[model samples]
Target chain A: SNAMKKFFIIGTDTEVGKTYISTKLIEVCEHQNIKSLCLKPVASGQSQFSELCEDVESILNAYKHKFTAAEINLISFNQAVAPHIIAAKTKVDISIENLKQFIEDKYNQDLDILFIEGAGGLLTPYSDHTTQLDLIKALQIPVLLVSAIKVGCINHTLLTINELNRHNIKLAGWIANCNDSNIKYIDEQINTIEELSGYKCSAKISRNADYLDFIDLSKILI
Target chain B: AMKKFFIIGTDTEVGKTYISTKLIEVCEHQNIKSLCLKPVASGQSELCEDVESILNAYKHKFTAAEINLISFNQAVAPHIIAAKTKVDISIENLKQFIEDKYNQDLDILFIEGAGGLLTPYSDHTTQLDLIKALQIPVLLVSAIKVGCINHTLLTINELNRHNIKLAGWIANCNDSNIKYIDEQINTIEELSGYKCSAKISRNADYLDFIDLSKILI
Candidate 1:
């Protein structure tokens, strides 16, 4: 097996389709005969973990190296809010130390790539002070930003890149989550994000493009 | 001049009412006649929850209907409701409505916006337009959430473009769990060159993030 390539999948905001991109990445890797593993460290806004949100279904179907429901989502809260908020209330341990241990465990496993999908945005807190960004920095792994192509994407994309740069974190590439069918001026949006962000748009995912047929793997996978 | 400000946020659901209430609580302690108005709102639970929260925070005789001008049934954006309701969400119309209340027996007035600065409260107008129309200082209620730095900075940029005095910002400890809440505010202050007037944490029953002496002129 090849050396495990690790990428922390993060989104600009909730509902920006991080799950879609994660699922697609796994599926695309499978088609290329690249074995992949996905682990969602923390999930919230659900009552317990019946299947642990939409990630379970999308990833379960697409993944070649499948994990159990609990294995995939390591930590989940019952409340329908931010994990840290729920964690503080319920006294659950969602610290960066804990999440790092989860990702660390899978590193030794046999896999081509290990995808650690994040909760909420890059700056979503693991605890009161530490965020997913801190966790990413701690892991010292590259990140793949899932920028939702929407009205405030320009600011979000630019700022996301800015924060990443501020932290000196390696950004593999940012993917545009064109989740909506009626995203006005698709080319210009992509052009602006690319032009302004100084980063290539790795993937142009549609509402449901089947898989990464439209994406060029050479540009994305390191 | 009366102590009046347009309360705006980094995004929707960022605790504008929480900040508004804090300001109201402080003004009440000083025996200052203050009124916070939600000129146009969406998602009223018979009585708008925000208006009710504001009503509870505020010490005034204004009815729930009086506190909020337009209340929608669903929790959609106001513009969508305006399109159906045929409400005049124009900045000009709203400006006149808010200005006419200036003569009331009030020492301070607050016009809480429906959403963020760029949110289209009506089909044709945004809270930004309203701020421009009013020509008043703005107190940004920045929720110290994950994306606070970006949204707060972007909002500051827009405010700077309009040459509006940002009065100051209120860093709402929205989650009561963001570990770097203070550092995030520091980041915003260093980047935007404006100090956070009040960094309020989550309260017990009645919150205590309101300190209007520094912010109130």
Candidate 2:
């Protein structure tokens, strides 16, 4: 049982591979003989059992931890929509403090590092009243912004970075995951993010990248 | 002098098609020959419910096969669909196609955009850029819900940044129980400096509430 190094995984937009990077980072920690726990606070648009979601299972499997379906996800909804809409439909109270308390309890013991993956984009609503950005601020953890390298990403990345900077939250660097290689000007966009955000990208993950060797998690995963 | 307007949304499922249909219906009722086209549509073909509704509003001015030219079957972003199918969504071609398809005899033509203002049409162009290039007055459709204030303001900021003219907007009350609904619309009007031309209350028929004369010149 030990205090854990915690980081929050956020995305510029939904489907930008935040979960993909989180799962890979956890595997990286596991390779170093470090025990880790990945927490997916809330997920939406799931029709089946929430435990079977790719991110939840990958995190649990990486740690060789055995947990039932109920233990895997705290809150989940059937509709494939934003978290706030899902919360409205399910009539659930998404208390930021309650979710943070859940993480705090787990972070205090039996882990070397912890990764909390956020739902959707930085501005995405986790409830009717608050967003995932607010949750990150309350947690006071540095953010690993995962962006999909595609056309018009420059605008999306800049806007998200601008908001993160405005909130005075520390950005733990970013990852350029190329979900579609048909994109042009990948390098230029990467340089633009570094130039604009003042944070260098730590990795360039290709579509279906199998390794995390290229990433530099040294600054934040201590 | 033919009139054409582009309908853009703050986000997907925000009632772009709903407002477009309402506007078309108003034009139709006034004996104005109007044609509405949703270029780069997603999730369905011309047979999609929304497409059928729009075509019906136009009273079959364009055939289903004609409307299917710029659409795909997947209900996703248009750029992703284009990538998957290897279709080049050239903005110039989109404009050319619309121009070629325009009926000069018609009094009004409506072009509905795919997804939100920032939604990508192709690798190089976004819906926002398309609005700029088309140089058409925009009827921004915003869904009134939680967090709509941010979505609306951000869209307006981009519109202003791109210097796109706002023809006015419609507040579609997708959720009636949204907290402080009136305040949200009022704040948007104050910050955006454009009045809500029409407010479509929750589940209300959009045509009955929208005054076409106020929006369409």
Candidate 3:
């Protein structure tokens, strides 16, 4: 069996299909005979032990009822707010070290790949003093950037990529998440990022497609 | 030296164009020579309504092409249109073009950005690089509404990290219905360590808040 590889999934902005892309990546991994699991250790915007957070529920469905939301989400906020804000309000511990330990403790038995999703854009806050960049630095995991091919995406994509470049984080390529079917020139936007980043798009998932029908997931595997 | 301010927003459609015209009015109300330029605009190719509005507001004589260096026919991202149309929206060329205007005898130049600060001009360069290259102080136009604080802080933080000089920020509260607009601006000020220069109210015909002399420096 190949050694398990982990990737931190990040988005250009809030509501940019981080959860959808994570689940889709899980589906792709399953199809390639690569045992994969997605863990969203931190999430906001919904609460309740009965229903779980919005993202945790989506991830639970992505696992196809195989894993509970508890297994996937390690931290959740009852109030729909940023992690740092909730931490300050409730006095909950959400430091980088604590969050990283949660992921490390997640069960990875026979796992070929693990997908971890973050809350917001790269520079978004993870704590009072630390942003998500600090969290990524702590985890030391490669990042898979998700670019929603919309009007302002090019700006967000480049900013995230350059910030990642500055911090020496290994980029595991990016995905063109065509979440909105109305987005103009989808293919061209994907090409623009490739031209900008000099990295081929790892996958181009249409608005609601299952599995990367024509993509090669091998490059991001290691 | 002309006080050139690159107007950037936290997001697109945040009254950036509207705010630029108002800023120009502030300069004009003080009898300062002001010119507005949108170096690269995407929505209109032959004629930009935004450029026309700026001309009307400034009462200046820069043709659409004079201010708008490159125009794409599509109403999408410039880089997307540049990718399809094969126009060289290169930074080196854009910088040279802006400097030509900068050398004019004006007290202030309002260079309006296409979108937000990181909006791409070419496949590789963005409005941030343009501001960095031009060495112009940035005046961020932040919309006051739900979810505005995060984006404002993000924009300000990026400007701080990249060593870009932020002249100040403007709050465009076109919607008074947005709950706690004052509180939002207060939080952004506390987080960013900068004050909102002026707040543009709904359907404002003229700016009544800016201290033109303070910003002219």
Candidate 4:
């Protein structure tokens, strides 16, 4: 078993580009020659040769790891719905143990980091009983928040942070990934989010798709 | 023309869904085929025991298939959800969903709003926008815990501002041990300008003895 530091990418809400930003994270780690594995406990949407996961897989494939993009990314439910609803419709069960097993099984040799991404928000239900919060606690990794930049993000981000705090989840850092794509004054919005959460703006990503370097990503440290 | 009634609350977590679910039961009693549509649900649970328990207490007459409930993982207000997801909270889609089930033969249709009247469902549109777009009458559910007087009046005033029809108001007793509940009810009834159609008591036994058809028009 090699040393693998873990980074849990969390968003204020689901589909706030957790995958997109996570791929960027893997790219940053790869540039530094730090081996990493991008592990997502669950994914919804068509797994019939996915493009998003393919991109992430290609990034991870360049560095180290034998698992396919489809393989490293565990549990890809077909329907593009909430993980619980998808599981319900397909009659599949999601558990913390299975998720942990999948990650551990796919780990050939982890030397630098294991980037774990959750399907939805922190409080999303994996099954009828367990939630992403429960899984995060079980994984016991530091969380990096990926919040949207917009009108009510301050309130939403602060509320999410407060909620995670109640669950004793510590912050690794936060990235203000501009998912809005249309809103102006991105800096002001980021500043507002920083002001409210009292957490530094670890990185400000544009819709420009520029990847971050390790030197840049390290600034996100809480 | 069949009438559409949207149920909008004054704030988040204001017992709107509870009131709307009971209202659907009331509609079914009146021989009106009722459907409950939650346009934006923030939290998702697998078993949904809280809602299922309510349905359990409610399903003395109507069969379970008649009930419809949906929760979305986009927990923020619907506007933020639609914005970030790039998918419009389609009113056309909602209308189609309602029209398919809303037979002219039915008594009434109940459409439940997501959050407060001003609660955003899309970029520029509020819940009131959906209410207005649907062109439905609205039933405002008032939480009678504390600060209800302000919440109720604000909702009423805002409904008027948006020109959405207020069908009636219900004073829901959220807290069973509320002090001076009667005074609060009287205050809302007097100030709301709309008829106080019902005063729902906390843990009310109506779920057992009351038949909804007897009260339905």
Candidate 5:
């Protein structure tokens, strides 16, 4: 049995495929014959669905239905907006400690890895006064940044890295998802990011990549 | 007396060009002789959309060659385009270029920035740094998006950290699909300490969204 490890998947901004990469990480863990689970914990923008949030459902389905819907996402909101805004409108007090305890109670040393996904970006609001950064800081887990490659991405990535460092967070590495391959000097941009951060991107998922087939999962096992 | 303001967006495609055109329209209404300059623009073939819109609104007062100083053929990062074209987009050149335009002596000059506030104008310089050097008050344009709150706050935070003076901001309702937009606007107003000087709805006439007095003052 391997020692249990956990990773927090965060994004530079919203709609950068944090959930897609989270599901792929679960698949990678399964492929390595290591037991793994992914948790979304809290999700908003689920007004259209009845039960599970779209991201929670997708992650659970990818995990071969190992965890039930309610077990995966502890809280959900119908408003497709920021989590704190949704909580405020619905008059639901989202206690960060309760969410932390929920994840803590579910930890199992038997599992090889665990992934906790965050909403929107690093500064995305979880409560009025708190952000996803606070949650990651509380968990004390390493973060794997998932960034979208496009115009203005270099600045976004660097600003994100600056924030992570300011918060004293450990960034294990990053993954670049090409939002548009036709973007000029993309490879050079990625290389520049690696040089600037001193941590090479763990994976480079192509635009419209079906299952991240290009990545060698073992490379990101750390 | 000549007044100047630079238009910058919270993010790309956030209606910076649209807002610039409207500001010019407002200047015209006040009988204020204003010149709109794009300075540097990407997404060009024969003409940059930003330059064309400003010219159209100004009744073709300035030639295309006069408005867009540096034009790239592709819609990518300006620095990458500048490097590929072997053109120098250094801060010194940019400042000199704007100085030449400012010599036009218009009552008001609206210089529009390319891309977002933090968008790199060159590999070594950013739009934020350009704004800092110019010492011009910024009129930020923010479009409605799911995460506009975060983007807007971050942009404002950067501006304050860099000690850039923000004239005000306009809330553009670009995406009609977003929910609770009024609430979002209120939140931004309270948090940003800058209210919407003008509210722009989708596909509405730019002239209708302009209050030149608020911007000028």
Candidate 6:
């Protein structure tokens, strides 16, 4: 069993750089000699099984190359839709309780940092009854909220913060990953978000990963 | 290195405690010690009866203390509930209540929120206000009832407004016979893109609910 720090990476919305930030967190953990594993309760966007394997393989390669690809099992669904819908399509019985059981058993005693990436925004449904929030609540880990920087980001970002306050999920800081090149007043929006959230903006990632700056993970993950 | 979770719903009677119990059951099945916490519960017309009912329905081999449930006998929102019941739900008091579990150190702390995030937890503050004070990532328990898309989305949008990152959502099926359950689920998944953690049955016993293994991490 590796000493892994379980960190759940959630996005304000889908494609808000959850995987990207997850890869970065893994790299950060690896750089510190901390064993890391990226876990997704469910994953989609796979055209081929090999591609999916490669995606997981790449993260492990960049972070924990010693880990075998067999350890990563994509258990959610395949429809690229809500997990429940995909579950319906594939006839796989999924529930918040079962998902929690798998993570507890599979990653139980091992690992250093288990970065679990969530789907869509918070409150999105995985089942007819359970929600992404339920999974987060079930995991009980602090979250790294990834937000897409754009015009309405103010609303989207603050809305999540408000709900987080309502539900009492620990604020593990935020990553303002820039997705809009055309939006003006970046500082203004950032200021507004900072004022509302009261947590430091951990990182402001640009479009290209190669050019993105490394953030001091210690300050935020703590 | 140790992180525990507490599942709370955004709306009352939306099965917050029921789902929390099932989630705790999930943890218990994993051979992990689990607990459920309600920092401030109100509207207790039948404290012993309702809590006992929930305990009976959700708890299996797990005992009462395993739940670690708390309550305040106010049958209103936390604020009004507190007011009607004459309880002051200051964040400091709530923090003390949560920290009192220092000796437990259980794996999961499934605390059911009194009402929607905006439900008033205090006169000037709300459940959102309390959430802000705790700083934990939250899982919103959404009821897939009529007009849920708007209600759920708006509720989610409100959480986002506070920068309270939604860990994911539990689309608790209150009405299994809804016309467009699939469409609603897809809309939330496609539009919100938050993780779809699990789906509990509408009319089934909460204890008999399936263990949510798919989205546990």
Ten residues in sequence with the least summed lDDT for candidate 3 chain B: B204-213
Candidate 5's docking class is: acceptable
Which model, 1 or 2, shows the larger DockQ?
A: 1
Give one digit per residue, the lDDT tens place, for model 3 in B75-191. 787777787777678888888888898678898878888888777776677778888888778988888865566577767867877898999888889887775567667667766
Worst 10 residues of 2 chain A by lDDT: A211-220
Candidate 2 lDDT, tens digit per residue, A117-191?
887777666654566777889998888888888644655675667667768998877888877787765776676
C-alpha TM-scores of all predictions: 0.60, 0.58, 0.85, 0.51, 0.86, 0.51
Task: Predict model 5's lDDT versus the native.
Answer: 0.77
Clashing pairs in 1: A45-A80, A128-B177, A128-B178, A128-B179, A129-B179, A129-B180
- How well docked is model 6, in DockQ terms? 0.04
Alpha-carbon runs more than 4 Å astray in model 5? A1-4, A45-50, A104-112, A127-129, A179-185, A192-199, A207-217, B101-104, B203-212
lDDT of 2 by residue, B46-123 (tens): 367667778887778777665544776666556666877898878787877677656568777788877677676654
Instruction: Identify the runs in model 2 with alpha carbons over 4 angstroms from their true place.
Output: A1-3, A45-54, A66-72, A208-214, A217-222, B1-217
Residue-wise C-alpha lDDT for candidate 6, range A100-148, written one tens digit per residue:
8767676665576677777677766666566677888887777778887
TM-score of 2: 0.58
lDDT by residue for model 1 (A1-222), tens: 349888999887756888877877776788778778888778765533354565655566676435676678778765445566567667787878878887888777788888888887766556655667889999999999998876556546665676787788999988888888776555555766676566878878787664454455435875
Write the residue-wise lDDT of candidate 1 on B1-217 in tens digits.
Answer: 6878999888767889878887887888778888888887777656878888888886446777667767775555565556566766677767877898888988889989887776665434457778887899898998886567657776776777777778888888879766656666766777677878877876643334345556775
Displacement of the residue A44 alpha carbon in candidate 5, Å: 3.3
Q: What DockQ, between 0 and 1, does each candidate earn? A: 0.08, 0.07, 0.42, 0.03, 0.32, 0.04
What is candidate 4's lDDT per residue for A1-222, written digit by digit as tens?
355677778776655677777877777766666666777667766534554444345435554664566566667665454566557667788878988777666456755677777776665556555667777887777898887775445544655575566678888877887867776556755655565456877887767755563455755521
lDDT score of residue B210 within candidate 1? 40
Residue A196 Cα positional deviation in candidate 1, in Å, after optimal superposition:
1.9
> Which CAPRI category fits model 3?
acceptable
The TM-score leader among the candidates is 5
Candidate 3 per-residue lDDT over residues A1-222, each given as its tens digit: 247788999888777888877776776776777877788888887734554788888887777878877778777886554566666667777778877887777544778788889887776666545677888888888999888888877766776787788789999888888889998888877777788777898877776554453364454664
